[PDB]
Every structure is written in structure tokens, then in C-alpha cells.
């Protein structure tokens, strides 16, 4: 079988959804990419979609600090 | 976001998602306590 090389790309998302509600996302990741920018990555609950939230929002601010802990 | 924070993992670089979504509309809120600038 084979497996995608992975990692070889630039930015997972260059756009952000600036107004995501903590209510519509079940899981996030903090994309602190040295390659691109500080990105907020989230998975929608009902939509299940992988989207990115803008890091300048309010609830992401608390997320930022605590996400560094994994 | 959960209560005091969220506590999620820190991603260096990964391929769970390679392309940006259809999310074109982007305008961050500000305060959300008095008002969030966007009401709903």
C-alpha cells in the first residue's frame, strides 16, 4: 500500500472565519505555524467541517493561552 | 471557551486539512459583553 507524504504543503488555511461561535465547534487545534501564521483551526459540530477561526476574536483569546498546553 | 479555556493540541504543521474552506465572509467581533457588534 501507500501513504500520502503529508506535511509537504504551505498553509492549511489562508482564510479565517472571523466569527465562529464556540457553540458550533466541538474540536479545535492551535495552528501555530512558523511557516505561515498563528491560525485557529476548528471542527464544526453539526457541519463537521474543518474551518479556521480568526485569532483576533474574544473566545479564541482564552483558547490561545490554554491550547499551548495540549 | 469550554470554561476557563479549552486545552487542545498544538499543531506544528499537518495534512488533516490541506485547503482553505469556502468561508469567505470574515469580520471579527470585539467586546461581546455589552454587545458583540453582531447580534443573534
Amino acid at each position: 500500500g501507500m501513504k500520502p507524504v503529508s506535511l509537504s504543503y504551505r498553509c492549511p488555511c489562508r482564510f479565517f472565519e472571523s466569527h465562529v461561535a464556540r457553540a458550533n465547534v466541538k474540536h479545535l487545534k492551535i495552528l501555530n505555524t512558523p511557516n505561515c501564521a498563528l491560525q485557529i483551526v476548528a471542527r464544526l459540530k453539526n457541519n463537521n467541517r474543518q474551518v479556521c477561526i480568526d485569532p483576533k476574536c474574544k473566545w479564541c483569546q482564552e483558547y490561545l493561552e490554554k491550547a499551548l498546553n495540549k | 471557551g469550554s470554561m476557563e479555556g479549552i486545552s487542545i493540541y498544538t499543531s506544528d504543521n499537518y495534512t488533516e486539512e490541506m485547503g482553505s474552506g469556502d468561508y469567505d465572509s470574515m469580520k471579527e467581533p470585539a467586546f461581546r459583553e455589552e454587545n458583540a457588534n453582531f447580534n443573534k
Side-chain angles (χ1 to χ4, degrees):
Chain A
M2 297 183 62
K3 182 184 299 178
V5 178
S6 306
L7 190 165
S8 184
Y9 75 111
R10 295 184 179 183
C11 308
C13 54
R14 58 178 180 145
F15 289 98
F16 303 108
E17 216 306 337
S18 301
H19 49 201
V20 175
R22 178 57 269 223
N24 54 268
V25 293
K26 68 295 191 61
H27 173 58
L28 290 86
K29 306 74 169 305
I30 184 179
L31 270 290
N32 52 90
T33 59
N35 304 272
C36 303
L38 191 299
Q39 305 169 330
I40 312 299
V41 171
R43 287 293 186 163
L44 300 188
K45 302 182 176 178
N46 60 329
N47 291 26
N48 186 89
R49 298 188 63 169
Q50 206 281 211
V51 62
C52 299
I53 314 181
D54 187 278
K56 301 178 192 300
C57 70
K58 177 179 180 178
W59 66 268
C60 46
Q61 186 62 269
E62 288 301 284
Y63 137 115
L64 290 172
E65 303 299 278
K66 291 69 179 182
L68 300 177
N69 184 269
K70 177 178 63 178
Chain B
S2 185
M3 184 179 181
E4 55 181 83
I6 302 185
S7 179
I8 60 182
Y9 71 110
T10 175
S11 306
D12 300 89
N13 191 32
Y14 73 143
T15 311
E16 186 183 289
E17 180 57 279
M18 183 287 181
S20 303
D22 299 87
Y23 302 82
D24 177 74
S25 305
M26 62 180 302
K27 187 63 61 58
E28 312 76 273
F31 189 64
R32 186 179 185 183
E33 184 178 87
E34 176 65 271
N35 189 271
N37 299 333
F38 301 95
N39 62 89
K40 183 179 180 299

